[PDB]
UniProtKB/Swiss-Prot annotation, chain A:
UniProt pathway annotation: Amino-acid biosynthesis; L-isoleucine biosynthesis; L-isoleucine from 2-oxobutanoate: step 2/4; Amino-acid biosynthesis; L-valine biosynthesis; L-valine from pyruvate: step 2/4
PROSITE patterns: KARI_C, KARI_N
Native source organism of the sequence: Spinacia oleracea (Spinach)
Record protein name field: Ketol-acid reductoisomerase, chloroplastic
UniProt cofactor note: Binds 2 magnesium ions per subunit.
Catalysed reactions, as listed in the record: (2R)-2,3-dihydroxy-3-methylbutanoate + NADP(+) = (2S)-2-acetolactate + NADPH + H(+); (2R,3R)-2,3-dihydroxy-3-methylpentanoate + NADP(+) = (S)-2-ethyl-2-hydroxy-3-oxobutanoate + NADPH + H(+)
Lineage of the organism: Eukaryota, Viridiplantae, Streptophyta, Embryophyta, Tracheophyta
KARI C-terminal knotted domain mapped to chain residues: 225-373, 374-510
Family recorded in the similarity comment: Belongs to the ketol-acid reductoisomerase family.
Subcellular localization(s) per the UniProt record: Plastid, Chloroplast
KARI N-terminal Rossmann domain segment(s): 26-224
Enzyme class: oxidoreductase
């Protein structure tokens, strides 16, 4: 129900106890690559469909791991007719010269495992043609449970003669690739992933899923279901990971500058603080270490911010979660995908830019003269708002029924080890826009909601002398999630992602020199 | 909806070459009410929020003028705090005009379901079970059909189902009616629909109800066309969009060096005063023509940059309403007002305690009587561009001009804006329905962000003026259509002040 066990004939399963909850996990490592041929029995060609954020990263890691394993499995990229991604696929090493790049439908037809890494809205509007091209008894692998939610809305399901699995990286595509490359110097590195076995028609599903995750470089892989994954994931990206952190940062920058703080300092006290010291401390030492590093006066400011921000944050998170679970949000994303093209006598509306406004122009200037190795200030009030929202997200997921491994990755680990480093590197777009179409739409839709509720409720409470809810503070300090976060931290490799503004491993349209 | 009345006169209006049928109002038609209300001895008004207090009083007053013996009875839940309010308005248990909700539904010939839309969604089976065979269920919004559709359901087959939907807030329906008493009437235009009609009394019962409310003109629609345009419009130009624009522009103007006093005047006062007055009786073209040539250039830059980003959000909002996503969101939000699943209750909070609104209180404290605010060209350009973008979305999605003009133009300037001019954004937004209040809160931030990110950035980057867009605004057929509708407007302007006593109990001040 909240935790899910499984069996592997190839890999070693191990137990972790999180807040008294035993959960089974599979640790990663380059030393395990020799086990891939066994995990992939019956597979001659893996067809990677798409070339967005996850496909470029997954395809190269898979190819690199199989090469290290001395495997004969072919990794072939399949693209749609009108794609402009063929050149980038070749630059990454996939080409017609060696039969590793071709048409999307032809690629699906010849594949034993099909990794459907195209936009979620595109999967929603083209699944019938994907099913018609699958080999009977082959395996469809997803990296997000969105398609199940859409089928449920139509009262439909997957074919009956196909296995259906998922390996879902809890981090952005560029980080899955970058950490894997950095891991070549040691025993591997990467992004934690969840896996699911929705349908199994021959008994190979679990090992194929586990092999795929290990080949991606996942430090640890945990079990979930397609439904638990889409509910926590669509929600999480709109929450602490992208939407809420963006709204917090806009709201606080505006407050601080209105109050007399210079623009330079307001940017340092919001974005640099969150993406630097707050993230670094939470990554290796946890939220309690962060709070304990504040001065006595700093603790009072943290308390005022946390106390005022906790419930208004929960209000929006609660709303968002329910919209994801009900089907409302999934339908919204499918319809948004169609509006990217002209129809009904109306114009096309592709997504626009989110970093050309005041605080981001300020950010460019702060970064223009920022020395290398800067960790930012630990501004107490900013830490209070951020940690209050992170704790509110954990509570919502807890009350809605998710496992601790899922809760911790979706609300803590992903923010600090995968996402925040990109915002420290080059601002909000470098973080948000390197994520999926579903996540990019979600961030734009929900960031404004967090901004408004924090300004209208939380900040007004602070300015009207509201009493500090010390029970909330005490609850934070005694919360069982902190011990579980420490247990998960022990499975983290000792390689921190390296990213700068001029990174060439991000989406093509985001490259800058 | 081609209708036919046997009691009332139908008249044709031509809007941009499209003939539409309308029923004009007036207190002179009140004597026809007994005829219209064939088979009605009691009208059960269920609820006491924003629409019920206004409708119940307007109906009672009109029936008294018609010398009618029809009883108007208020139905409320258990130990509702509204009982005292209803009594203050003259409805009481002693004369049988105030009673229990279920008991009132059971004995009524026309049941006006004026409770929150989410409560209708979660309690319709109980309402249906209390309806007498061949009685009439009246709604003032098509939301319930939308919800039933999501469940693959419909209304009972032994009942008539109609709607009379005021295109304006509850307090304005009452206030304008009161102001129209000595001039043959005034009120808020309404749309009407007949979803189910058991015996042929449905059309005249709906038409009578509308005329009794004081509607200057009543136009025909369907329950589905009404919910699609209505849930969308309140999130658009009517509440959500105007709020986002005003927050967005206040921030820009003050960032550019404008004092807070002038930034509030150049945004809120400007839109809710002079802009609304001009559009109300002269139109959008007239507003543009009233600008100096430099003003016209500023208007053009704002309009050219704001039109498409505004349409982007409007297009998204409309499709979420038509698909069912938004209706479901509202039903679930209603449940979160109470504790469940071990989580806290989250009632709606306040939206007017932030910076620009505290500034507004100060601006109003020294505002002279009759002050209509400044006419700031850039502000007019942003506002008018969103108004035109909303008209185009409804046009492309298939709505009638009567429906488009009321939901995108008339309601904003004649019903809503006067309340924001009188006491800020909450006095306007929070006097509307639970559905509209949630909508305004969810969508205002969207308009604020897209305008700051795309439209204003384009202006700062020196984007060329889209000449075709400007040319099309100038020749748009909606302008003449708006002129025709204005001819049907009584020469009465709603009178509202900060201390209005006809607003929701919790919004009344001294
Ligand atoms: N981005 C991330 O880091 C995360 C994403 N995921 C999941 O991974 C999956 C892929 O996401 P992501 O990489 O972000 O991709 P995007 O959401 O960025 O989708 C863009 C890709 O989809 C393709 N596409 C769009 N429309 C069509 C169509 N009609 N037919 C065929 N292909 C189409 C594009 O093709 P083309 O190249 O030709 O233009 C491009 O390859 C999703 O399920 C997502 O939820 C999981 C974890 C994290
Ligand atoms: C924040 C982001 C990388 N995330 O994990 C996603 O699920 C996404 O891009 O859809
Ligand atoms: C803006 C408002 C008064 N409107 O007409 C509505 O439909 C409502 O309150 O639901
Ligand atoms: Cl690389
Ligand atoms: Cl009154
Ligand atoms: Mg995710
Ligand atoms: Mg996602
Ligand atoms: Mg309305
Ligand atoms: Mg409404």
């Amino acid at each position: 129900a909240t935790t899910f066990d499984f069996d592997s004939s190839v890999f070693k399963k191990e137990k972790v106890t999180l807040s008294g909850h035993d959960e089974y996990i599979v640790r990663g490592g380059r030393n395990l690559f020799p086990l891939l041929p066994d995990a992939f029995k019956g597979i001659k060609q893996i067809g990677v469909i798409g070339w967005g954020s996850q496909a470029p990263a997954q395809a190269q890691n898979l190819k690199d791991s199989l090469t290290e394993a001395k495997s004969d499995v072919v990794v072939k990229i399949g693209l749609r007719k009108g794609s402009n991604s063929f050149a980038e696929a070749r630059a990454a090493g996939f080409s017609e010269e060696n039969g590793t790049l071709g048409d999307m439908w032809e690629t699906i037809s010849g594949s034993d495992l099909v990794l459907l890494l195209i936009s979620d809205s595109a999967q929603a509007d083209n699944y019938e043609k994907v099913f018609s091209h699958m080999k009977p008894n082959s395996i469809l692998g997803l990296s997000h449970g969105f398609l199940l939610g859409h089928l449920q809305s139509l009262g439909q399901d997957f074919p009956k003669n196909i296995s259906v699995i998922a390996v879902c990286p809890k981090g952005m595509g560029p980080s899955v690739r970058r950490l894997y490359v950095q891991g070549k110097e040691v025993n591997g590195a990467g992004i934690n992933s969840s896996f699911a076995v929705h349908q199994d028609v021959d008994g190979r599903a679990t090992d194929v899923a586990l092999g795929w995750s290990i080949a991606l470089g996942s430090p640890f892989t945990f079990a979930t279901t397609l439904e638990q994954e889409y509910k926590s994931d669509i929600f999480g990206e709109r929450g602490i990971l992208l939407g809420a952190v963006h709204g917090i940062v806009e709201c606080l920058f505006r407050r601080y500058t209105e109050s007399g703080m210079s623009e330079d300092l307001a940017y340092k006290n919001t974005v640099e603080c969150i993406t630097g010291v707050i993230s670094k401390t939470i990554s290796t030492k946890g939220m309690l270490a962060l709070y304990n590093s504040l001065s006595e006066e700093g603790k009072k400011d943290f308390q005022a911010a946390y106390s005022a921000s906790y419930y208004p944050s929960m209000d929006i998170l609660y709303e968002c979660y329910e919209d994801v679970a009900s089907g409302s949000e999934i339908r919204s994303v499918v319809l948004a995908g169609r509006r990217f093209y002209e129809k009904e006598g109306l114009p096309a509306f592709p997504m626009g830019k989110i970093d050309q406004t005041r605080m981001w122009k300020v950010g460019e200037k702060v970064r223009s003269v920022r020395p290398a190795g800067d960790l930012g200030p630990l501004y107490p009030f900013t830490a209070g708002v951020y940690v209050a929202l992170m704790m509110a997200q954990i509570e919502i997921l807890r009350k809605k029924g998710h496992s601790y491994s899922e809760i911790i990755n979706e609300s803590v680990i992903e923010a600090v080890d995968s996402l925040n480093p990109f915002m420290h590197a080059r601002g909000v777009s470098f973080m948000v826009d390197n994520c999926s179409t579903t996540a990019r739409l979600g961030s734009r839709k929900w960031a404004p909601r967090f901004d408004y509720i924090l300004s209208q409720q939380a900040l007004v409470a602070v300015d009207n002398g509201a009493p500090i809810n010390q029970d909330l503070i005490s609850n934070f300090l005694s919360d069982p999630v902190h011990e579980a976060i420490g247990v998960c931290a022990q499975l983290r490799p000792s390689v921190d992602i390296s990213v700068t503004a001029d990174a060439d491993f991000v989406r093509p349209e985001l490259r800058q020199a």
